[PDB]
Curated annotation (Swiss-Prot):
It comes from the Bacteria. Inhibited by ferulenol. Keywords: Disulfide bond, Membrane, Oxidoreductase, Quinone, Redox-active center, Transmembrane, Transmembrane helix. Disulfide bonds join A34-C40, C112-C115, C191-C194, C213-C226. It is an enzyme of class 1 (oxidoreductase). Residues 168-264 are annotated as: Thioredoxin-like domain. It comes from Synechococcus sp. (strain JA-2-3B'a(2-13)). A quinone binds at residues 43-49, 93-104. InterPro entries: Thioredoxin-like_sf, VKOR, VKOR/LTO1, VKOR_sf. Its main location: membrane. The record marks A34, C40, C191, C194 as: Important for the reduction of the redox-active Cys-130 and Cys-133. It is a multi-pass membrane protein. This is Vitamin K epoxide reductase homolog. It is found in: Membrane.
Length: 264
């Protein structure tokens, strides 16, 4: 009943998923499955999927390679520190993953199988670590978690708040011009490319006239308003009667919008 073999076995698998989720991003190859419009295509290609410059998969590698090491190292300065070390580490791993899951539930509204697996794997770990050895302290486990979780979440968010810079400075100037001219961007929410186009503006985009094209996601016919103006792919800008395809630079959009760029 008590075992740390379920640890090394899950931690091994965890290591492999993470390993070639990293190898994928790190070589920019597509994920073995997906590319079916949004999904792992959006998720993996979105920001967040990188953490402090490296792949977030690569972060999860350190996690899954940590938990494996502890589980596989024989009882050594670890005998005393194994089952607390394992706990703190896995606590962190569950916390991170709940925020990742949150990202998918809200503020991506999209899911990834490779990412879901990760979660379930860590959920297997979380069960095992709690039930695979008891201190029967109760109060400390409940505390220790709430600490580590709070420490993970604070750092995690504080890294992802570092991820998006201010909408500066024409980013806001243009978003107000587009709002006034009525130049509109048509795009999906599941579209990675549109997310990129949204990225260039930053928090300024909230002014931009946007038309959500598929309110019911992938595989379902697009909203009428998009089919009326004659959209095919995303993103599409119709600014001043003229239509423009794909992502374009703030400079390129300024030209299409009649915004006066000044450098003298």
């Amino acid at each position: 009943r008590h075992s740390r073999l379920i640890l090394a076995i899950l931690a091994g698998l965890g290591s492999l998923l993470t390993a070639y989720l990293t190898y994928t991003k790190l070589t920019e190859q597509p994920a073995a499955f997906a590319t079916g419009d949004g999904g792992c295509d959006l998720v993996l290609s979105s920001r967040w999927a990188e953490f402090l410059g490296i792949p977030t998969a690569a972060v999860g590698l350190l996690g899954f390679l940590g938990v494996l090491a502890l589980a596989v190292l024989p009882d050594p300065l670890v005998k005393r520190w194994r089952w607390p070390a394992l706990f703190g580490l896995v606590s962190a791993m569950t916390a991170f993953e709940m925020y990742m899951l949150y990202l998918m539930v809200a503020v991506l509204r999209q899911f990834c199988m490779y990412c879901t697996t990760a979660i379930i794997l860590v959920a297997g770990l979380g069960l095992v670590t709690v039930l695979g050895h008891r201190w029967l302290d109760g109060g400390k486990l409940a505390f220790s978690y709430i600490l580590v979780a709070f420490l993970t979440l604070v750092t995690t968010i504080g890294v992802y708040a570092n991820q998006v810079p201010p909408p500066s400075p024409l980013a806001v100037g243009l978003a107000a011009h587009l709002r006034q001219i009525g130049g509109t961007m048509y795009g999906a929410y599941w579209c990675p490319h549109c997310q990129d186009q949204k990225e260039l503006f930053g928090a300024a985009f909230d002014q931009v006239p946007y038309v959500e094209c598929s309110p019911n996601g992938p595989g379902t016919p697009q909203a009428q308003e998009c089919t009326e103006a004659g959209i095919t792919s995303y993103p599409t800008w119709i600014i001043n009667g003229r239509t423009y395809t794909g992502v374009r630079s703030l400079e390129a959009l300024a030209v299409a919008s009649g915004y006066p760029l000044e450098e003298g």
